[PDB]
Write a protein that binds this ligand. Sequence first.
Ligand SMILES: [Mg+2]
Ligand SMILES: [Mg+2]
Ligand SMILES: [Mg+2]
Ligand SMILES: [Mg+2]
Lengths: 375, 375
Amino acid sequence: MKITDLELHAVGIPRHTGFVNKHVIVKIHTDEGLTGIGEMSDFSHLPLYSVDLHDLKQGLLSILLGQNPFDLMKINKELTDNFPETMYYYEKGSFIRNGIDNALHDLCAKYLDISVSDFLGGRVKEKIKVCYPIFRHRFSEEVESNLDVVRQKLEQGFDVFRLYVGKNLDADEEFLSRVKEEFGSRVRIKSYDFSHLLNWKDAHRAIKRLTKYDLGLEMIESPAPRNDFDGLYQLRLKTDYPISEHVWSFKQQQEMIKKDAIDIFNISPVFIGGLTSAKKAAYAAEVASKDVVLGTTQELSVGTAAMAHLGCSLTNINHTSDPTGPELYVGDVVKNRVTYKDGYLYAPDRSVKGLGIELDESLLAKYQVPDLSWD
Amino acid sequence: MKITDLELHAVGIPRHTGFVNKHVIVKIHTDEGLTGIGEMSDFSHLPLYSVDLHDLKQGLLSILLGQNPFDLMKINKELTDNFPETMYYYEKGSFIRNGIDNALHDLCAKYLDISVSDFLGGRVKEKIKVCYPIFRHRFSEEVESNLDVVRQKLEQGFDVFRLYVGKNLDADEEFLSRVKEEFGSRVRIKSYDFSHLLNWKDAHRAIKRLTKYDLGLEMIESPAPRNDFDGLYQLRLKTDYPISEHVWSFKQQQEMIKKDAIDIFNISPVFIGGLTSAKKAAYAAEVASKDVVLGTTQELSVGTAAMAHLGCSLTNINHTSDPTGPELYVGDVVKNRVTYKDGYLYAPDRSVKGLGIELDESLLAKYQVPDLSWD
Ligand SMILES: [Mg+2]
Ligand SMILES: [Mg+2]
Ligand SMILES: [Mg+2]
Ligand SMILES: [Mg+2]
C-alpha cells in the first residue's frame, strides 16, 4: 500500500453574505487505486500573504511519495518537521497538515472498508450538539438583522448559537436583551466569544455586564489576548462560567494545562494540524481531566465530516460544539453535504467506508479558483 | 510626500558552500522621485511553503499606496495588523515587514538628506565587534575542515567566532580543544549556540563540559527549546555565563523580561519586523536594564547595513554581535558591498544620505530568481 500521487484543488465558495473563502481540496492516490480525500479548510485568514500551491504540491509529494498511508505517526512527524507549529492561531501550515492527515484517515478507512469512526476509536454517541454563529456587532443598527438570523436558523432547528462580542458592548447587550425578550428560553447562546480582542481585565468588565443575560450560557471563549496564559488563569478565577480557548499548538496547550488556565479546550483539526494531532490534543485534555469542545474555521462538508467522526468518539465533550460551516456557504463540492437536525451534527452512516462523503467533480470545477490569492 | 509604487525583486545568491538562499529586495517609490530600498532577508527557512510575490505586492501596495513614509508608527501598526506576530522564530511575515520598514527608513533619511544613523538617534560608536560562524559538527571528521576555516578567517581579520553546538558534543569538544591548541588566545569563541536543539537539562550537561574550554566565552545562546521561558530561567540560575536568546515577537520578549529568563537579548530586524520594531525591542531591554547583541539570519549588504546603523546607536550592546552574512555569499546586488575590518562592522558613511548602500541593477538581474519556491 503506497502513495503514488497527490492533487490539490483550490476552490472559492461564497458565503451567503458575499465573502468568498478559499479552501483546498486534497486527493491522495495510491498504487491500488484507492484515493483519500481531505480539506485544507479556510486559507482566508491573516497573515495577508498566500501560499504557492504549485510549489506546495511538490514539497508535499516529496514527503508522501511511496509512503504507507498507515504510517500516520511517521508521516505526521515529517509533516510537522516541514510545517512547524508556531503558537499562532491561523498558521497556514496547520491547515496544510490538516488536509493531508485527514485525507490519510479517509484513505486508510477506505482500504479497510470501515468508517473513519471505527478507525478513530468507534462511537460514544451518534451525534453532537452544535451551534450557529452570530458574528460581532459593530453598530446597534446591526441588531435587527441578527435577530432575523436567529429566528431563521431556529426555524431550521438550530436553537443554540454562539455570539462574538467585545467590539461594541452596548450593541452586544442590546442583541442579548432583544433575544431574551423575543425568544425567551426557545434560544440559547452557549458562548460569548471575545476573539482575543480584549485584555483580561477589560474582558472581566465586559463579562460582568453581558452575563446579566444567561440564556443557557455554557462558556466564555478567548477572553484574553492570544497566548496570555496568566491572564486566562486570573480571569478563570474571577468568572463563574467555564473559560474556553482554542488549541493551536501543543506548546500552547501544554502551558494552559500546566497553569490550569482554562476549563474547556476548544479543539479543531484545522488549527492543530489534522485528526491525528486533534486526537492527541483531546487525549492530553482527557489525561488532565479537562473538558473539550470541537471548534471551527467554517469548513465545508469534507472538513466538517472529519469532526463529526471525531466528535462522536470522544468521552470528554460535555458542552455544545461549533462546527456549522456548511450553513454559511451557498454551496459545496460534494454529492451529499453533512447532516444537521435539531442543532445536532451527525456522524456519517457507520456502514459507509471512509469519511462517508463524496466529491462532486462538476462542483469542484464550478467553484475552482486559480490560486489562493487575496482580494 | 507620498508612496506611489512598490517593487519586489526575488534574488538567489549562492553561499560559498553551494546552498542558494532566496531574498527579496524592496523598492518603495514616491511622488517626489525618491526611492527607499530594503531587504526581506533569507526566506529559506521552514515552514516548507513559499509566498506568492505577485499577490504580496498587491497586498502591500494596498497598505502603502498614498501614505506618508514618515508615518512609521501608523504604517508599522497596519503592517502588524496584516502580518501578525506568531511567536515563531522564522515567521515569514516578520521578514516581509522588515523589508518594508527598513526601506521606509532609507526613504525618510534620503528625503531629509541625512544618514539613517541620524534618523535612529545618532552615533554612540563608529563600529561594533562581530563574529564569524562555525556551524555545528555532526561528525568529528569535520573538525579539520572547520579549523581551516578559523585559520583563513583569522588571517582575514576575524579573531572572534561563535560556535553552533549540540549535535555531537564529542566533535564540539574536539574542535574547541584543537582551536585552543593551535591558536590559543589568538582567537575567541564568544558564544556556544544550541539553536534550541536540547531541552534545558540536556543543555546544562553540554554546557558543563563545553565550558571547560573558555576562549573569551561571552554567552550561551538558545540553550532551551523555543519559547521555553521557564527552562531558560532555571538554566540562567545554574549557569555562570550570560544566557542569550533571540527575540522573535514582543509577546515572547515580554515573557522573557517578566520571568527574568535571560541575560542578553539577541535582536535582529529580520526576526522582529524591521528597524522600527527592533528599536522598540532594544529600548524595552534598556528599560529592563538588560544587555543586547545584534543577531543575524545571514542577510546581504542592504540588510546588514540596517544593523550597522542600529548597532552604532545603541548604548546597551556590551558584547560581540553576529551579523557577518556577506561573508557567506559569493556575491550581492549592491555597488558597495558590506565588508569587515579586524572583526568589526562599521556604520555606513554618515555623510551619505539614506542607508548608504546603492543597488546595482546588473547584479540585481544576474541573481534574479523567478519566485521564492523551494528546491
Ligand atoms: Mg472561538
Ligand atoms: Mg475560518
Ligand atoms: Mg543564535
Ligand atoms: Mg537565515
